[PDB]
Amino acid sequence: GNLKDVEHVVILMQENRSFDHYFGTLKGVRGFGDRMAIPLPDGQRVWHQKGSKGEILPYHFDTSTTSAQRVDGTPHTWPDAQQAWNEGRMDKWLPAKTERSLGYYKEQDIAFQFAMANAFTICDAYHCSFQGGTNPNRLFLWTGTNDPLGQHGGPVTTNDHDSNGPVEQGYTWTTYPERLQAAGITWRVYQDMADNFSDNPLIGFRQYRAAAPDSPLIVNGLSTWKLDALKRDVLANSLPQVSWIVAPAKYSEHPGPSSPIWGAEYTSWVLDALTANPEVWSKTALLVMFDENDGFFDHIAPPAAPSLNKDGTLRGKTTADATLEWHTKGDIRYRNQPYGLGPRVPMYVISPWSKGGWVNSQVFDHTSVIRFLEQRFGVMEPNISPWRRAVCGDLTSAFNFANPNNEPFPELPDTSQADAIVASQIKLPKPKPPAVAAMPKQEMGIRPARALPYELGVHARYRSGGDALSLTFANTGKAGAVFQVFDLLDSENPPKRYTVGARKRLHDSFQGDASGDYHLEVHGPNGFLRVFRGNLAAPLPEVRIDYEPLFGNLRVQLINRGRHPVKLTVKDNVYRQGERRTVNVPPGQRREVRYSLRSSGNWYDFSVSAQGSDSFLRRFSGRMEDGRSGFSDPGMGLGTLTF
Ligand SMILES: [Ca+2]
Ligand SMILES: [Ca+2]
């Protein structure tokens, strides 16, 4: 059993919902109970958003007492997405997106969505491709790019080509369906051309605008084939190899014309069509995701290339060329910022090879959908930037192709009363933040988790008469990754970002402050954390963490480069009830401690401190990958609680 058993890929991109907005309270995903949330400039965790009325924490949109089923939508364009993200500080959601940005649903409000996630596989590191709105993000899905170099009609930061227009003003880069067409791969866009909410970006391209009505580009890309036609194709065993579905406005899940319950109803209709023929369904993978987050808050700091400085230098470093990531033309606002990745959105992977309520925490974006098609059918998309190929995955890790399951679907909630539900709930008052802000809560509980291609380290070195801490960002795994470095002693400048491709390393230096103090928090994928605190101006302790996955062990090297011995204590923070070990390390030597991580499912969270220092700290947390499936963080729900 393997990827070649997929005969049909179906892609349903809905509209305008962030991951936390739906699933911040879903057990077993990285939600409001995240133990590894990033800090804001004031030193509090990212939840503590502030605006003109003070702090507004995430708060529940209660569809039983308010009209939040039809909440008023929030800003979602390039400038306000960049404003909220604020170069990765993640601290301006309220002025950029309004107080409605911080509202979230719970299970009782969106039962169908929860049931889909619990029946299949939910991706909790799937990001939209572009910070802003609709057509830029959909251009990444269908073509891999928004033309950042601006010589084929871009750069695209607006929706101004989401409709028909003069041939000579159409975009002129190549679309992925054209490459499929030429390779003989069958493909179709299912939509109503009279009501597709301008959610088909192919209409913006010269080669489609100029095409004859019997062109395969028009017949398959810009014609009306509704869900009745989809179901007929499934029953006839004539479903294409690659299908996109583009919902009507009312059913798109967008807050403007739609709602979660109408989006669920339409998704249910898609499921009814695709399951109509069991033989066809047994060979089908359905991907359901969102084009962007509206302006709804999501707390995960998006992976992104370093920003471009005025002098051509970068703030951060990258092993992968990031030329195509920077906004350098067009809109004068936010020049030299990266275009993405944008905030997390829901991605559901629904197939015979993705049942069971799994979570997958590999970083993906909309180009990952194309990458999945590259892996399966072999048609390459050269528009995808090298940075996106390094940092975003190909979706294959979201499946287990060796264990197909062709039983009937679990029951999913009924959506037939959607119209009556909305009609009743719009009679309720508009949702508002609570008078007293309170932290959101996520229930504890573990979810089976897919194996991830990540093996990462951050190794520190400092010198006695030195001015700075040297960090090595080491990627010894099979997929690239972004490390985000927060300087907890600098509340003004933005965090630095380091892109390290698979089997590579980067190095940088980090200065002490006036006293020689440093305090750095380094975040990576799926809860990866390395903390460095100390003073640079007796023992000189250091640690080096290495994985021994074949034996299920973590190797902790305790190093002393100083002239006197030091007692170093290794303390568990959450998985072993605060277990501690103490090691005396002679001058100019090192000593080793090994931990078997079997009892915690390869999760670890330890802090190393030195007797006689109130400041020195090395903290390390994450999950040690070993190629086998695992579980979500058993501590999800605990927030910053530590022993
Ligand atoms: Ca949208
Ligand atoms: Ca739209």
DSSP state string for 397-462: GG--TTS---SPPPP----TTHHHHHHHHTTSPPP---SS-----------EE------EEEEEEE
Q: Please, are residues 299 and 21 in contact by the beta-carbon 8 Å criterion?
A: no
Q: Please, are residues 104 and 20 in contact by the beta-carbon 8 Å criterion?
A: yes
The closest of 435, 601, 618, 593 to 520, measured between CA atoms, is 618
Distance (Å, rounded) from C-alpha 403 to C-alpha 405?
A: 6
| Structure obtained using | X-ray
The closest of 49, 5, 116, 69 to 440, measured between CA atoms, is 49
Angle at Cα 520 formed by Cα 459 and Cα 393, nearest 5°?
Answer: 65
Tokens at 323, concatenated: 């030329």
The closest of 312, 483, 305 to 388, measured between CA atoms, is 305
436-452 core/surface letters (b: 16 or more CB in 10 A; e: else): ebeebebeeebbebbeb
Q: Please, are residues 294 and 81 in contact by the beta-carbon 8 Å criterion?
A: no
Q: Which of the ligands is closest to the CA of residue 258? A: 2
Q: Which amino acid is at 398?
A: A
- Number of other CB atoms surrounding residue 140 within 10 Å: 30
Q: Please, are residues 200 and 246 in contact by the beta-carbon 8 Å criterion?
A: yes
For ion ligand 1, residues whose CB falls within 5 Å: 15-16, 134, 291
Q: How far is CA 175 from the centre of its chain?
A: 24
DSSP state string for 45-110: BTT--EETTEE---EE--TTTSSGGGPPP---SHHHHHHHHGGGT---HHHHH-GGGGEE--TTTS
CB-facing half-sphere around the CA of 185: CA atoms within 13 A: 20
Angle at Cα 635 formed by Cα 353 and Cα 91, nearest 5°?
Answer: 95
Distance 437 CA to ligand 2 centre (A): 32
Q: Please, are residues 78 and 157 in contact by the beta-carbon 8 Å criterion?
A: yes
Distance (Å, rounded) from C-alpha 175 to C-alpha 202?
A: 8
Q: What is the DSSP letter of 309?
A: P
Q: Which amino acid is at 429?
A: P
39-59 core/surface letters (b: 16 or more CB in 10 A; e: else): bbbeeeebbbbbbeeeebbbb
Distance (Å, rounded) from C-alpha 270 to C-alpha 119?
A: 16
Distance 484 CA to ligand 1 centre (A): 27
What is residue 487's three-state secondary structure? strand
CA distances from residue 621 to 526, 572, 604 in whole angstroms, order as listed: 10, 10, 5
The closest of 339, 290, 302 to 16, measured between CA atoms, is 290
Distance (Å, rounded) from C-alpha 29 to C-alpha 32?
A: 9
Distance (Å, rounded) from C-alpha 521 to C-alpha 530?
A: 6
Q: Which of the ligands is closest to the CA of residue 290? A: 1
Q: Which of the ligands is closest to the CA of residue 200? A: 2
Angle at Cα 599 formed by Cα 596 and Cα 600, nearest 5°?
Answer: 95
Tokens at 169, concatenated: 């003003």
Any residues with CB less than 8 A from the CB of 172 and at least 6 apart, and which? Answer: 152, 153, 205, 206, 207
Q: How far is CA 261 from the centre of its chain?
A: 24
Distance 15 CA to ligand 1 centre (A): 5
The closest of 574, 601, 16, 104 to 294, measured between CA atoms, is 16
Distance (Å, rounded) from C-alpha 83 to C-alpha 91?
A: 9
**Rg, C-alpha atoms of the chain:** 25
- Identify residues after which the chain is interrupted (C–N over 2.5 A): 537
Any residues with CB less than 8 A from the CB of 326 and at least 6 apart, and which? Answer: 148, 305, 307, 308, 336, 337, 338, 339
Q: Which of the ligands is closest to the CA of residue 14? A: 1
DSSP state string for 565-598: -EEEEEEESSSSTT-EEEEEE-TTEEEEEEEE-G
Domain boundaries, the chain: 3-27+110-425, 448-631
Beta bridge partners of 517: 535
Q: Please, are residues 323 and 329 in contact by the beta-carbon 8 Å criterion?
A: no
CA distances from residue 490 to 39, 43, 487 in whole angstroms, order as listed: 12, 10, 5
Cis peptide before 155 (omega within 30 of 0): yes
Distance (Å, rounded) from C-alpha 575 to C-alpha 643?
A: 9
Any residues with CB less than 8 A from the CB of 556 and at least 6 apart, and which? Answer: 543, 544, 545, 570, 592, 593, 594, 595, 606, 608
Q: Which amino acid is at 114?
A: F
Strand order from edge to edge, sheet including 553-560 = 541-548, 553-560, 589-596
Q: Which of the ligands is closest to the CA of residue 250? A: 2
The closest of 320, 339, 302 to 157, measured between CA atoms, is 339
Tokens at 155, concatenated: 């750069």
Tokens at 257, concatenated: 């014309």
Q: Please, are residues 145 and 381 in contact by the beta-carbon 8 Å criterion?
A: no
CB-facing half-sphere around the CA of 560: CA atoms within 13 A: 22
Distance 151 CA to ligand 1 centre (A): 25
Distance 254 CA to ligand 2 centre (A): 7
Distance 374 CA to ligand 2 centre (A): 27
Q: Which of the ligands is closest to the CA of residue 198? A: 2
Task: Write down the residue that tokens 């190095």 correspond to.
Answer: 507
CA distances from residue 538 to 225, 464, 511, 610 in whole angstroms, order as listed: 75, 10, 21, 12
Beta bridge partners of 630: 449
Q: Please, are residues 532 and 520 in contact by the beta-carbon 8 Å criterion?
A: yes
Beta bridge partners of 459: 472
Q: Which of the ligands is closest to the CA of residue 294? A: 1
- Number of other CB atoms surrounding residue 326 within 10 Å: 20
Distance (Å, rounded) from C-alpha 163 to C-alpha 269?
A: 26
Distance (Å, rounded) from C-alpha 359 to C-alpha 219?
A: 37
- How far the first Cα of the chain sits from its last, in Å, is 44
Distance (Å, rounded) from C-alpha 333 to C-alpha 244?
A: 33
Distance 16 CA to ligand 2 centre (A): 8
Q: Which of the ligands is closest to the CA of residue 291? A: 1
The closest of 70, 48, 73 to 59, measured between CA atoms, is 48
Distance (Å, rounded) from C-alpha 222 to C-alpha 578?
A: 60
Q: Which of the ligands is closest to the CA of residue 366? A: 1
Cis peptide before 341 (omega within 30 of 0): yes
CATH number for the domain whose boundaries are 3-27+110-425: 3.40.720.10
Beta bridge partners of 60: 104
Any residues with CB less than 8 A from the CB of 398 and at least 6 apart, and which? Answer: 121, 123, 349, 354, 358, 360, 362, 450
DSSP state string for 253-264: --TTT--HHHHH
Helix, strand, coil % (nearest 5) of the chain? 25, 25, 50
Distance 133 CA to ligand 1 centre (A): 5
- Number of other CB atoms surrounding residue 638 within 10 Å: 16
Q: What is the DSSP letter of 327?
A: -
Tokens at 18, concatenated: 């962030």
Distance 145 CA to ligand 2 centre (A): 18
Q: Please, are residues 283 and 10 in contact by the beta-carbon 8 Å criterion?
A: no
